[PDB]
Amino acid sequence: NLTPLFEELLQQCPPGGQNKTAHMVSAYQLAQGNWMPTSCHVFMGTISARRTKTHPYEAYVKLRELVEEHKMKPGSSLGKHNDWIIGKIKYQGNLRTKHMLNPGKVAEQLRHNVYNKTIGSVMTATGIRLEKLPVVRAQTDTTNFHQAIRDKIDKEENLQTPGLHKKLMEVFNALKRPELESSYDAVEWEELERGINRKGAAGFFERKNIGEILDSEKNKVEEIIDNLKKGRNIKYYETAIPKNEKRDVNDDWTAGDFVDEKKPRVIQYPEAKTRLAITKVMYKWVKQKPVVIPGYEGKTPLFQIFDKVKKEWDQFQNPVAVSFDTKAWDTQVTTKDLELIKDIQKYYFKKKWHKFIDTLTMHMTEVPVICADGEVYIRKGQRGSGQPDTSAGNSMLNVLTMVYAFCEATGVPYKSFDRVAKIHVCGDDGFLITERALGEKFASKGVQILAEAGKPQKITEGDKMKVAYQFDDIEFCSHTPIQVRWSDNTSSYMPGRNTTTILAKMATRLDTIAYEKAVAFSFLLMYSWNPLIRRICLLVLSTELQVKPGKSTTYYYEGDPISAYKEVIGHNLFDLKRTSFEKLAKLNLSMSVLGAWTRHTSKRLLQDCVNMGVKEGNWLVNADRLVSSKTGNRYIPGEGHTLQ
């Protein structure tokens, strides 16, 4: 009876190891009685207990009593290499951090959400009520920023199962790529400068951005590579800014705005010179060239991912997908976690970079962080979202932890995972596909195993992980599959997501037509299954055909945008005859719940398209099958290509 109460309490128990000298009893066995807990250190949902004619409620109070005894049982020396930050302190701290040093505040140092006028007025022109759309890209004030630090970052390091990381290494040895052992070397400046955003943000004490440092202070970056390579301390620090601040900029191209959306509330990032030093050396690992993390989908475009996943899904008999959903992952990365990734990096890198990886990793286990306003805190481990290693490091750490959790829950051995499951990851996001019995075992017992591995899962109904029983219930990269029907009698899947959300993201920005047409084409590649969005996209793309699209967003087109689409999607926009009736109903629901559209909106948007398309000429709106059906005119595309 009391079994769900014990299961809740066992997730707060400190992780222990296997105890062969005592009786280890589960949440079920404790609820039945005559079992008395002797300690609260949890191992695979079991704790050590003396069989002493107990009553269920009495066993529960002893186990809670022991858990609170352990919780009510410390300040930490600062590392020498971090001492330099204390000499920059100018005023006493006011972060009021309870678990990490707030040594004070350094001297001060020298963006808003607005509408995209053309995209926003096309929406208004059809009766879409913008004010009813959800708010996106919210920036936060200093006060809630510091509260977010106390809430998420001010914490002792997660305890993990003893020996967890030897096991995880055992999992890596089942997935390593031995033909690459000890081959990774640094890259040349030319190759580094190819894939980098010159507007990459400067750290607190910096003034130049990535491109400016590239142009004029390469020697400063090389001095840093040299110091680390010889094992010498550098003055490593990360800067803290709230999400969506002027300095919340991505160094590298992004598969979509979904990657800004999953960012922590607190962005923490090394200096630009330092992000450059790390990347010039660890390029092949942090940019996954080649891909050595199994299931890593970082380089897969959003319009391909679900077609790729369906092929795996179809090869199972009775497939399910279990979601990876860790609470505030970056805050759950431990020192031992980063050191596990250090050992794996050293597997693939030439020996002359091991002292480099060793010293950087050492710098990353205790990190001076400087807030926008100047407040310093000393972070113990964790991941700063802006580190170059976030995507690659979290992806491997995710894959390893999840294979281990699945393998320990199901009894499948680490070397046999590839035989009964497929895994897919993008940083902490992901899922695996497997047969239904295997997945349900992993989804019920995985919660407790993942809490003991120091990656707690977001609390749910029935203390179970989310299972998808039908393919288009998979959730990945903030999107979910939706099927479309083409006029060549094939079907395929597109990245689907709520229409209210797509409208929000498309209609706003943080601080002109060339940019909006880029956005429109960018959204048209992802959301052509959505007739509302598809038509708003074609109307915007119809604007000022003499102006060429900007380059500051995910994608843009050279030449014709309808032909560019055909090149990456594999069909013509005009050939898309049907979008999944049911899934579209699900993704349009919030439109009506929020009242962002009326009964008139779709017709008015179609009518505005037909009015433009019936007139004499060659109009992008007629690339829409239904619009062209009502105008009797077609769009004849020119040559066109898609770019990043």
Numbering used by the authors: 13 to 85, 89 to 125, 131 to 531, 538 to 670
Give verbatim excerpts from the published study on this entry.
To better understand the nature of the NTD–RdRP intra-molecular interface interactions and whether they regulate the RdRP fidelity, we designed point mutations at the Y471 and E472 sites in the context of the WT NS5B and the N- and C-terminal deletion mutants. Crystallization screenings were performed for all the NTD containing mutant constructs and four of them were successfully crystallized with one construct crystallized under two different conditions. Among these five structures, three of them (Y471A and two forms of C-672_Y471A) maintain the WT conformation with the NTD–RdRP intra-molecular interface maintained. These structural data together suggest that the selection of Y471-E472 mutation sites is valid in perturbing the NTD–RdRP interface, but the interface may not necessarily be fully disrupted by some of the mutations. Although NTD–RdRP disengagement, a situation mimicked by the crystallographic open conformation state in a crystal lattice or the N-91 construct in solution, results in fidelity reduction, engaged NTD–RdRP with perturbation from point mutations can achieve similar level of fidelity reduction.
Compared to the RdRPs of other Flaviviridae representatives such as the NS5 of the Japanese encephalitis virus (JEV) and dengue virus (DENV) in the Flavivirus genus and the NS5B of the hepatitis C virus (HCV) of the Hepacivirus genus, the pestivirus NS5B contains a unique ∼90-residue N-terminal domain (NTD) that does not have notable sequence homology to any other viral or host proteins. The global conformation of our CSFV NS5B structures is consistent with the recently reported CSFV structure with an RMSD value of 0.9 Å (95% coverage) between the reported structure and our representative C-682 structure. These structures together reveal that the NTD adopts a globular α/β fold with an α-β-α-β-β-α pattern. The NTD interacts with the palm of the RdRP core intra-molecularly with a mixture of hydrophobic and hydrogen bonding interactions. Collectively, these biochemical data indicated that the RNA synthesis fidelity of CSFV NS5B is fine-tuned by its NTD through the intra-molecular interactions with the RdRP palm.
